[PDB]
Structures are given as C-alpha cells and as structure tokens.
From Swiss-Prot, chains A, B:
It catalyses: ATP + H2O = ADP + phosphate + H(+). ADP binds at Y44, G45, G97, T98, N99, F100, M166, S167, K168, G409, D496. The lineage of its organism: Eukaryota, Metazoa, Chordata, Craniata, Vertebrata. It comes from Homo sapiens. This is T-complex protein 1 subunit theta. Component of the chaperonin-containing T-complex (TRiC), a hexadecamer composed of two identical back-to-back stacked rings enclosing a protein folding chamber. Each ring is made up of eight different subunits: TCP1/CCT1, CCT2, CCT3, CCT4, CCT5, CCT6A/CCT6, CCT7, CCT8. Interacts with PACRG. Interacts with DNAAF4. Interacts with synaptic plasticity regulator PANTS. There is a cross-link at K221, K251, K257 (Glycyl lysine isopeptide (Lys-Gly) (interchain with G-Cter in SUMO2)).
UniProtKB/Swiss-Prot annotation, chain C:
ADP binds at G41, G93, T94, T95, S96. It is found in: Cytoplasm. It comes from Homo sapiens (Human). It comes from the Eukaryota. The chain holds residues 1 to 156 of 543 of the full protein. The modification N-acetylmethionine is found at M1. This is T-complex protein 1 subunit eta. Belongs to the TCP-1 chaperonin family. Coiled coil: none annotated. Component of the chaperonin-containing T-complex (TRiC), a hexadecamer composed of two identical back-to-back stacked rings enclosing a protein folding chamber. Each ring is made up of eight different subunits: TCP1/CCT1, CCT2, CCT3, CCT4, CCT5, CCT6A/CCT6, CCT7, CCT8. Interacts with PACRG. Interacts with DLEC1. ATP binds at G41, G93, S96. Mg(2+) binds at D92.
UniProtKB/Swiss-Prot annotation, chain D:
One of its GO terms (molecular function) is WD40-repeat domain binding. It catalyses: ATP + H2O = ADP + phosphate + H(+). It comes from Homo sapiens. It is found in: Cytoplasm. Mg(2+) binds at D89. PANTHER family: CHAPERONIN (PTHR11353). The modification N-acetylalanine is found at A1. There is a cross-link at K250 (Glycyl lysine isopeptide (Lys-Gly) (interchain with G-Cter in SUMO2)). This is T-complex protein 1 subunit zeta. Its EC number is 3.6.1.-. One of its GO terms (biological process) is positive regulation of telomerase RNA localization to Cajal body. ADP binds at G38, G90, T91, T92, S93, T157, K158, A410, D495. The lineage of its organism: Eukaryota, Metazoa, Chordata, Craniata, Vertebrata. PROSITE patterns: TCP1_1 (PS00750), TCP1_2 (PS00751), TCP1_3 (PS00995).
Amino acid sequence: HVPKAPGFAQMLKEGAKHFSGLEEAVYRNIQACKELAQTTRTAYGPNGMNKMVINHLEKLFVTNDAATILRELEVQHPAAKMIVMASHMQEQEVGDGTNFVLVFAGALLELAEELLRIGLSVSEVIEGYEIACRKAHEILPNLVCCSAKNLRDIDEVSSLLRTSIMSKQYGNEVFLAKLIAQACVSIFPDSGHFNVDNIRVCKILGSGISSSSVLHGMVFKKETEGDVTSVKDAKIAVYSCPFDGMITETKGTVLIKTAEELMNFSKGEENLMDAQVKAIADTGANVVVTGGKVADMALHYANKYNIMLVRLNSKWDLRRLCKTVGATALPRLTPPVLEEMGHCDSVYLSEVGDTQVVVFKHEKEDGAISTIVLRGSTDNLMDDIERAVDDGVNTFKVLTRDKRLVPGGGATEIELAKQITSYGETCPGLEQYAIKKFAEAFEAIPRALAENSGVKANEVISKLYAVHQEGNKNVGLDIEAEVPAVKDMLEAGILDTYLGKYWAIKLATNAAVTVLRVDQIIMAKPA
Amino acid sequence: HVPKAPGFAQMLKEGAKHFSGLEEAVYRNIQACKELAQTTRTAYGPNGMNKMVINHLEKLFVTNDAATILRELEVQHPAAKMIVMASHMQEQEVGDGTNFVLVFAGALLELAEELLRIGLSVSEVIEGYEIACRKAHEILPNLVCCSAKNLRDIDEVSSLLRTSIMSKQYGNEVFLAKLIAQACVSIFPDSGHFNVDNIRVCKILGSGISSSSVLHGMVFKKETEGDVTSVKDAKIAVYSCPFDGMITETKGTVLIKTAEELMNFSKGEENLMDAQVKAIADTGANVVVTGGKVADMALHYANKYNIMLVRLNSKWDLRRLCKTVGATALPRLTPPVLEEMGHCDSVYLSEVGDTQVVVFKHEKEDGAISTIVLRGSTDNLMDDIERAVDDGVNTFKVLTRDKRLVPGGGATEIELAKQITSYGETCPGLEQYAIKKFAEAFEAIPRALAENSGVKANEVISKLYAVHQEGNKNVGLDIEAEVPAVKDMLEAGILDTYLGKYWAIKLATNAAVTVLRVDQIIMAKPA
Amino acid sequence: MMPTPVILLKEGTDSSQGIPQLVSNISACQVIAEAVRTTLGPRGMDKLIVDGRGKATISNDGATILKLLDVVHPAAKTLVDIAKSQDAEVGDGTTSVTLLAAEFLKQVKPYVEEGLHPQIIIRAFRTATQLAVNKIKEIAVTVKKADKVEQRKLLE
Amino acid sequence: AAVKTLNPKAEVARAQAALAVNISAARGLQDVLRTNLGPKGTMKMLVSGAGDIKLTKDGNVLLHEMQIQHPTASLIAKVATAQDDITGDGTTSNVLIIGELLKQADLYISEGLHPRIITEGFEAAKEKALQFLEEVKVSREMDRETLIDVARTSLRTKVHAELADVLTEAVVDSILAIKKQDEPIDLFMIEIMEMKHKSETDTSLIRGLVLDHGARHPDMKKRVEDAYILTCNVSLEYEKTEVNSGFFYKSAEEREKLVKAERKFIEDRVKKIIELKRKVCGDSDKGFVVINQKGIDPFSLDALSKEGIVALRRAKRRNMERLTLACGGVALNSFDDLSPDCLGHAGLVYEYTLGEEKFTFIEKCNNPRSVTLLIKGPNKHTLTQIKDAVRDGLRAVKNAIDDGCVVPGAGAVEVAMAEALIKHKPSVKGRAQLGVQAFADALLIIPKVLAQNSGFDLQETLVKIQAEHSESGQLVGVDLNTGEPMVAAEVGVWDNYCVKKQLLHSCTVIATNILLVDEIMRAGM
C-alpha cells in the first residue's frame, strides 16, 4: 500500500545535511542571529536585569555583562557564531560597547529579511548597507560635543568614567567612580601611554562594597614562615633560585674514602650557608623573596640575621614585584647584593577578612602599581564589581588614545538615523531601500533602552524625533524616571567614546554583511 | 574505507531476482535440466536400480518407475518442470516409455549447449532440431518389422507384453506375463474399445508372488452381518437406499392425541418393515447390496427371510459391481425387483491373508471385470508389482491402437541416429550441425543401457554401429550377460511401443525447444 | 561445497548413492536383528519393553518385540514387515525370519563392496531359494492314520 | 557472475550498467562546482566536526572537504588535486570539462555505438584543439601593466570585490622583487603571516621579514636602530657529555667548584659573541641582534643581556634561510672565525604585541630579495580566505612571468576553439565525427556556466557570441555585466597557456579512461 519516494540524483552522503536557497539558508542564518539578540536584550542598559548562567563546568556566573555571558553560552549554530565572535574585536579594541554588535548587526540582518522577500537580493542590500555605513563615518565626526582635554585631575576623571560604571553598577555610580579615579590617576603616564596592566584587583570576602579601597602597592595571600613580619627599612632582594643551596647540573655524587672526610663533611654545609646569608645581611637586606622552598638551615640563618622570607610561587608575581620595588631578580645564590635591591616604605602582614596577607606598601614611590581591594558579602558581588573596574581602566585608555566624546543616551543614534534616512531619500535608484533600513538599525538601539526602562517605546521614539527639528541633536532618553520626558543629555553628563562608536559601526556592519554573503550551508556529522 | 557500488537502473523490486542472457538465463536452465536427467538415469533400463524416496508426508515409496518417482520429488526449478510435465503427457498418451522423455530431452539440451558456445544461437538450433525431427518421423514407418495381427489369443499376448514387464520387474517377466494374459483376454471388447478400467488389482499381505492369481469377478473387504454367507443361486439386488425404511426430507413430527395411538404406533412400524423386506424376498432374491446403514429390525427380518447383506460404502465400488453382476442400483426403497436383478455363479466369504473378504465369482459370464490378486511379504513389493500390472494393461491398449512394432533394444535408436546423420551430411548449409546433433541425442539412449549393465559403453556402442553396415538393421543391445556380443532383436523377441516412440520424440523435442526459447527470467520474491 | 548452484533442482533433500548406501543399509539390518537374537530356542530369554508412558509388555515373540522397536531407518523396517507376513502365513515364524534375512546380507557383505553387479546377486538369491523350498517338500513326512488316535497324538 | 560464485559478498556491475555509475558520479560533482565558476559564483559554508567554519568557494577545498563517498568521485578528485600543484587555479574548469565529455558521450554511446568509438574521436579532437591553442598566444612583453590585469583577473574570483585593490599591488610587487635576469622565481622567498589586528582591507607588504618570536629577557631593547644581524645555529644551552658518568667529588666546597667548572664551556661560547659588538665601531647605539636558532638557557641570555645584546631563540628552519639572505649576513654553524664580515644590516628592528603574542619585525633592508605579507583579518575564517587568495595570486602572476605569452580570456578561446573543431568535423573521414561534435560542445561548458552564474539566458548569450565571432575575426567571449560579446584584450581578462594545456590533456586522459570501464567490481574482502 504505502509508497516511498526514491532518491533523486546524488545521494552520496553518509549522514551529512545540506541547506540551500534564500529561505532555507539565508533566512535561517538571519533568524538564528535574532535569537541571540533577544537572549542578551533583557540585560541591555543600566535598567537591565541580571542572568544566572551555569556553564559546562557547573560554575555559576551572575552578571549583566554580555561580554562574559556570551563566553559561557555554548552556541553551536554555524552562522550564529560569527555575530558572537565579532563582539571580541569590540572588547579588544576599546573594551566597551559589546552590546552594540548584537543590537545593530542583528537589526541589519532582520531588516534585510524585510527586503529580501519583496525585492532585490543580497547583492544589492549589502551595497546599500556599505554605502550607508560610509556615510555614517562622515556624520559621526560632526556630532562630537566635548573633549577630555581640560582639568585632567581626580575630579574630572571621576566624572568622565561615570558612564563606564553606571551602565552596569547602577547604585554604585559614585562610590566606584572615586576608587577607579584614584587608581588611574596614581599611575598617570605623564600624558603618555596608559598601561592598563599596572592596576590589579584583590578580592577579600567581608562586608559590603563601602569597605573597598585602593592600595599603592602589592598584596599577596601567602604566609611568612618566620618571625620577622614587621619591616620598616624594607630593602627587598628578589631571587629566582630556591633558598636551600645549589647543586650541579650534570649529576652529583659524594664519594668518601676515610673517616675524617665523613666526620667533617656536614660542617662544610653549615659554613657555606652562614656566609651566603651573611653576604646580604651585611648589605642591609630586610626582605628576601624566592620562588622556591626554604631549607631548615635557611630558616635557622634567616632568623639569625633578622631577614624576612616571602615565597611567591607565581612567576608573574615575582616579575611584577621586581618592577614595583625597583629590583633585579638574581638567578644565583645570594651574593653581597649592593645595588639590585628595591625599596618600600612599609612591609607588613595583616589579617584581613580572616586571610593573612603580605603588603608591600609604597608611600613615596606611589606611581608604580595600584591594587584595588574589593570587599563584599558574596563572591558573585566581588566578581561583578571587578568587571566594572575593568571597564573603567579600559575607558581611561580609550580617552587617552582619543579624547573626543560623543553625546550618549540615544541622542547620536537618532541623529544618525535622521541624516542617513535623508540621504537615502535623495538617492536616484533602488539602493535607497537598504539605506533607509540601515538608518532604522540605529533606531532599534534607543528602543531597547526604552523597553527595559519601563516606558512605551513607540512614544519615546516619536518624541525623540519631534525634539530633533534640525537644530537640537542633543536630547536623548531620560530613563531615571517614569514618563519619557526627554531632555538634554549633555547637561546631565551622558557622553563618551568617539572611537568605540566609530569602530562599532564599521565592525557590526561587516558582521551583518558576512552572514548575508553566505549562499549554501554544508553540514558535517557531529562527533 | 572501501566504498560500495551504488544501484544501477532498475532497483525498484522488493528483493526479487532477475536473470537475462546466454550465460545467466539460457545455460542455467540447461544446467538444471542436466541434474534432472542425471537423477533418473540410475534407474534407466531393465538393469536399473531402485530408489527409496521419503516424501513430504513421511511415507516411504520404493520403485524404479520414473513416472511415479517424479510426482513424489518436489522439483522446484522452473526449467526442470518443463521436462517433467512432458513426461506426464507421455504417461497420459501411451502409459509407457516415460523415461525416454528425460533422457532424450536432456541430451537435446546438453548438445544444444555445445552449439551455443561455439556458434549459432537458439534461433537456428531449434529450427535444425525440427528439421531433423520431421525426418525422424519419416524414418520410423520404414523400421516396422512385425505386427500384432496374428494369433490374437492368450498365447501371443503372453509374449507381446513381456517387454513392458521385464523393463521394471525383471525376474517376474514370465510369471506376471501369464497373469496379465489371462486378464487382457477376459474382457475382449468384441473387437471394440479395450477398456483398461475393467482390470483391477487386489493387494493382500502374505506369501510371495507365486501365490498371485486372477479372479473372474470382484473381491471386497467387508462383512456380511449374518449366517448366510454361502450363496449358490446368487440372485442379487442392488440398492442405494438405506436399509431402515422411509424417512422424511425436512423434519417430521409425530402427533398423538389418545393412548391407542401411542401404544400402536411402534407396533405398526414393525409391521410395515416386515412388508418392506418381504417385497424383495417374494422375488427369490439371495443377496441385497447397499451402501447405507442397516437397522436392527432390518437384520431381524434379514434372518427371517434368509437374506444375505453386503455393505459397500464406496459409490464407485458399488457401480462397478452393478456392471459386474448385471443389475441396476435402485435409489428407492426395495420393491419386488424382477427385471433388474443380477446373477453370479458363486458368492461366498473367505479369510484370505487374515482379511475377511466377500467374493462375487463369475464362471459363465466372465468377461465383465477381472481382479488380479497379488500376494507378497511386504507392502512395498505389492505396490511395485501393481504398477507393473498397469503397464501390461495399458500396453495392450497401445497394441490395439497401433499394431505395428519396431525392433527394440536400441535397434530403432541406432537406425534413427545413422539415417538422420546421413541426411544432415547432404544439407548445403549450417543446419547440418544441429541435424547431426539431433542424431547424437539418440546415441545417448543405448549408452545409458550399457552403463547400467556393467559393460563398457564406448565399446558396446562401437559394436552397435559396426553391425549395421547397410544390410542388417535389426541387431540391438544384449544386456543379459557380460560382453554383450550384440544379437538380433527379432530372434530375441525384443520389440514394443512403436506408437510410444512416435509421441515420445514429439514430447521430448517440444520440452527441449521450450527451454531453449527462454532468454530472460523474471522472478518473484521467494517465500 | 561442491553442489552449490544458484538455484537448486528440488528444495533441501539428502541423497546418497552407490556402495556406501548399500553398506549402511546392510549394517542397519544387522542392528535391528539384535532384538530377537536371544529369543530362539527352548532356553531363550524374554524381553521387557516399555513405551513412553511407562507401560511394559513382557514377551519373547517377534510379533510383539519387532512391532515396538519404533524403527525409522528406511531399510531396516523391512526386517519388521516380514514378521507381520509370517505372523499371518505361519503364525510363529517370527523371530527366525528376521535373523535369517539379516544373515543373508551378512554372508554377501564382504563381496558386494567390490563390484559384483546387483543383477547376479538377485539371480543367485532366487536360484538358491527355489532349490531350498523344493527340497523341504521332498523330505517332509506324512501319516496314513487319519481319523484315529494316532492323528490326535500327532497334534499333541 | 563469476565473482559472486567465488565470493558471495563480491560486487560486479554489468557492461550496460557500469557506464551509468561512472557518469552519475561525475554529474553529481558537476552539480556542485558549476555554482562557483567566475567572480559571480556563490560562496559555500563548510562546517567541520570541530566547529570550524570555512567560507570559501575554491574548487580544490570544495572537492577535498566534502562528504561524498563514491569510487568514481574519488578518481576525479585525484586529477583535480594535481591542478593546485602545477597550475594553481582552474580546478572548477577541469571538472566541468570532464563532466560534459562523459555526459555528452552517453547521447551517442546509448544510440547503439561501442564506447571505443567516442574515445577515438576525443583523442583526435584533442589534437585539433591543441593546434588552435597555439594560434591564440599573445605576446605582451610581460609588462608590469599586463601582470596587474592578470592579478586582478585571478584575485577577483577569491575576494569580495573590495580587497582586490589591496592585494593586486601586493601580488604584482611581491612576485617581481624576488629575482631578476630571467631566473626562475622561488615562491619560498615570500612569507605570509597572520594577525588579528583590524580588517581584511588593511593587508600590508613588508619589505623585510617578521619572526613569530621576540626577546626572552626584560632588559633587551624594544627598539633597535642601525642593527647588525647575526644568524647562527649554535647551541648555547647547557649540554652534558655523551658518556653518562657524572662528577665524583668529596666536599661541599668542591660541589660549588664543579658548578663553576661545568658551565665554562657555555662562557667560552657566549664570550665569543660579546666581542662582535665591540668590533663594529661601537661609539653609538650600533644595535646587536643575534638570532640563535636553537635553544638557549637563561644563563646565556643573561650573560648577553648584561652587555646590551639582544638575542632570540627557537626559530624555524626556514627563518635562517630567508633572514640570512634578507639581512645580507653569513649563516654560521660555529664560532671558529667570528668577525664583523659575518654580520648583516637592518635599519630598524622592533617588536609589537597583539593579544599577548609577540611579533618581531626586521625591516629597512637594501635588497632583501624576500618579502612578508601581513594579513590583518578580523576573524579566523577571514585569515583563511585571504591566505588562499595571496598564494593563488602569486602563482597566477608567476605563470605570466614564466610564460612569455598570455592566452585570451575566460570564454574568448573556448567558443572559437569549439568552432574550429566543428569546421573540421568531416575531416576525420569516418565514425569519429560524433566525437568531434561531443568534444566541441563540451568545450562550451565554460561560457555556458558563466552565462548562467551571471544570471543571463544560457542560449541567447551563446548564440550572440557565436554569431559575433563567426561574422568577424575577434576572439569575443562572455561579458559578465552586459551579456554582450566583448574582446578579452579590451575588458582585461587573460589566462595562461599552462592552464589550457592541462585542461585539454588531463580531461581527455581521464574521460577516455572512465568511458572504457565496463566491469566495476569489488573483491578481496
């Protein structure tokens, strides 16, 4: 009874699947990208909500920062990966605005679907997107409002970094702004290259965020293994050799022929070890730092000559310490070091949060390294605050590289949509359809700000255009209160990051074009 | 690793097989036919051997007669069936010579293979076989040496039928010839149609064949249920009605309204039954034969009127008796039958082989039906002898249908092979090759007789040709002794089945042609 | 390995031919004869035969022993059927006919394996058989004292 | 079948069936690669098992990275693979010709003819096609402007039409600035390096060379000017003796003396290096950079650092060939005769770190005869796309430099060649006329597929081109923008003789071998 359809022409696969055609390949790639854009939409903006994400290692991450959420979502779709990977170049270049990619590039892909069904294929929609993108790069340099040139001090930096904090840590926009300004300014590179790697974070469980502070120096979580824990002169000698003597590299074997050679053998080891420690005691050594273990006799002599020992197993901790205190690490046993020692002002141990730590404090030579000490009741709080610290450190670098600030709060995005649309209306051809849609990709961004803020997006957008009658260009979204009641963004101080907006538009456009140029999908069998 | 070949063009079956071409269809059909011919070859000829065959019913059948072996062996190959069916037609036509069909038809197909592999396709081999076959039927009327016209009595028939008996029952060729001669003459149809169904065989376990005899009448294996088993006048009435009075055809019910009707009902019925039996007793009848049941009151009155009863449950056995005794079977209850009564000379019962039998013996009016009574130590022997009896009965009919005889013992086959070859040698074309092969198909037959006789066939066949140098045409094969030293067949008395050879060649040729015409075979899925 | 065509002639039969088929047939006849070998003579023994239900019959007559063997060998059955016939024709020729038939095959067994065309075997069997039964008739004795006490004593 | 009798699990094809199996697979492959011919072709997404995405349409990768399991397709893949060793591009064209030589032949073999007949005609048709190919060679004196047209013709087919303006210059200049005086160009003198810096259209051409490793000591200069380059393969790490005996001593004081003693062979080798910096008139920066290809312990690195000498380690075997040439130095395997004469020269050496990966740049050489192309693609798949375009482009212009002539463009020869075969069709004087017809029509698969991929009507495009050629003398072909016939020399599309030679030979050998198989079988398992 029941018939079956035969094969057709080329059933030579072993279980692979194939997709081709506008609806089966192109649209499915677009729709898969939309699903990711929706996933991160909830967390978008300072009024967004947190996710609780458990990754494939059963580790729990609680945050709203898409840069770390996307790294834990095990996306397998062969095309959706591309719009996710684009976000890495955004984070690497400027360190902020990663949300732009999924919103803007996602919108360009969705909006293309609205055209590909009724008219021209991707060979023309892409051209319109690329033309309009080039025009956006002519509009944006003319929307710059301020420059971070004047009053380069603690108070202007606290204000300039506000946007990088209040966008994720809503309630901490003041407290964290003060801490991050102290760390960025303390290593001010005399108007040179800002080194983001000279700011560390130390997480110590305890009370709430108000107990966080900045410490001009390094903090380690090791013990002393000795009784010289209070050092005031703090001449620091760092070594890479273990503090237990030295042996040969070929083989080593001790041969004894008679009794006098046996009985007097051990005495030679004590005489050598005493002189080796004395060599640096006579030079004023206060602290000896090693990566290796300490011998029982090494402790005997360390206490004899009142020298504090610190063991740092991490090679990077040893390298950073040498660069902090101004010391050279010696690979050999302790010589009478004369000039290779560093200097601190106060070196001590303290029990903080029921953890004993080693502090190398610099009061005079402050601008060498900064540590930001974060307190909190949960690990989740401290991990999320650290991300806010990194955004501030990166934002400072971006301002150093390019000091121009562009109005935020959706004001620039509406203005880009307005001018780009007007350009499209004057194009004597069919490309105007994608140029106008390129403009709408920008309108999608303040719409996301409206939805998560609890105000009706259609009313917000209508007002934002009504207040931009060719001469304003500055009113954006007020999302701190009920009722849109749109006002000037620059009086409030919402502006930043020219470079990020320039790069983000170029990168996000290219990601959308990359997906649209895919004609056929050839799947492999999973393993 | 290693790939597999895909489908080709017609992979639309559900597991069916398919063959086409000279090698896959034609040769395979011929090869199956060879196995068939070889299976029956061992039993060929008066010196053949017996087979023991166990059929699908777990019954043991032992014989050398291929006509009864082939119907028991479940041949399935569609090619072999074509020859088997021809052998059944030979049995239907003359009843003897069936071996011929498998030997000759096999030889035609084997020799056809020799031609197909070197030269002409079946489109000419088949035509060449027909050309030679037509000539064979012009040779056969010129090989007649005797006729069954003189001495048409019991003595000549005891010699004419021996060739059909010795071919299966070697050592009984004299004893059985005497018995069948007494039967064939007993139903002489006054120079009309010889009715082969008027000779029956009755098998009774006991001593060996020497105790067999012919009885002029019928023997049954039923009882009398009375003490009047010996009847000398044998005035016989035959009925099909049950011996218990009249019954209804629908239902019937007895309505009683008074005591007198209840009391007298049963007694009235017994009085009616008395009259029903008296009706025929008044006619002088001695034996009443029925196929139905007998009531207790019928036995009561049968003893009153001294009536012998016989019950024959088989309608065909009773009809045969009616024609034997000269009576009509009446479907109605026993009237005073006067003009439809039968007569025998002696009707009696006896215990023969521990079986109580009823004998209806005729001495004066003998030629109505004859029963040949066979004894033997095993059922297997008696079944095989019965088949030998059938050959004698059917051979007599064949001799009546065509009274001409040609020399046997291979003499006819050698003359056909020689004369047919001479014709082919004069044909100015390619048909000479198939004509010569048609002749060789006959040579295979006396070769089979030599092989089963324990003599070297290559020298025997050389002698059979050497002694036919245009002036003999009668010497055949002597299979009675080692070193045949071939002798005249007419002096030997070996000659029979002229008509059988005529039709056997036609049936064997048609079987070979039918196989050769199959070039393509389409099979159903096996189940 | 050898008879492996694509299509078989029949179905799945077993087939044997020639000298090994006769040797097996003779051997099977020697085995079935064993049932009665010890039942001959006034000093023979009886047999106890039990069916699958546990029901036993005790006897020494071949008319009972040979019918309960449940022989399935196609050829060995012959040495039972001949007892059925002797039971009808003689009445007590039972155990003796099975043993004699088995011996007829044993005496020729060493010769039938080396040629010896079956036709001459049948000719010799028939020749000797007819001679033996003719001699019996020439040596059997009768009486002329019918309807006398002498005939009753003969029956005893 | 005999093989089934011997082995019930043996396969065999019938004479009328094996041909269909071979042709069907060829048609399946044609249905894939026909969609990538020319700049108008499609781009395929190849999804692998690790999750890697390759967005490519190169004929060679598509044939390699495909789940097609067929004994005939495995054979076409073999002759196709060879394309990328001797001619580079043209793989799509190779398969397209083979597919039509097998497909068109079926329309004459099935009509009662023996497969030998069509194959004898195919061989005869090849001879005529080869003679025509010789008559269309154009000598353009291999000017740089001709090479630009060659580079653009090839590059357009592997880029997104924006990158061509960047690679065209990088391909033409990189291939020329290697060897002069009509000496064969060794492509191993051109490096391709991958970085993830900016965008596809920021690929740079570096006059000098870049190493994938940097300084291994914090005191080494990050910027070195007026540098001397020492390229040595010496071993400056600690080594032991061959015989594993070790030291035999009594006292702890001897233990320390053994440490000083066993390392002396290291100081003897390193102290011979520090002399070189002092012999190159060290009254200024006069930077000293030592490559030291093999492993080096921190003892030796620190000994050299104290003298202000920059030292690298763990270089590749091919780094010591290109770098020694580029810097003008002498490759040393020992320190027996060290002198400034062994040192090279580089105007500037510097490092740059991207994603915590160091790249060392040795630049400002006089005539290094070796260049590095630096790809700055934003994503992994973009690095693959460009790298393939670079190495293909370099081969395309190399062939135009080695071959003194160029061949007219994509369809300019294929249509005229097909007409040359038909015009001589009756000259075979026999049954091979059908082989000429099948061959001449198979030649048209290139302008026919190009017409379809560009979106133009198949039949109207070819009728117009064939008429324009027949009534004129110009080698006109398919224009992918208008569909009208145009001359290859005016639109700027060229091919190489080596490509047309292989297409006419390799497709005939393979097609005629396939058509003469009639008993495909599997055995031995």
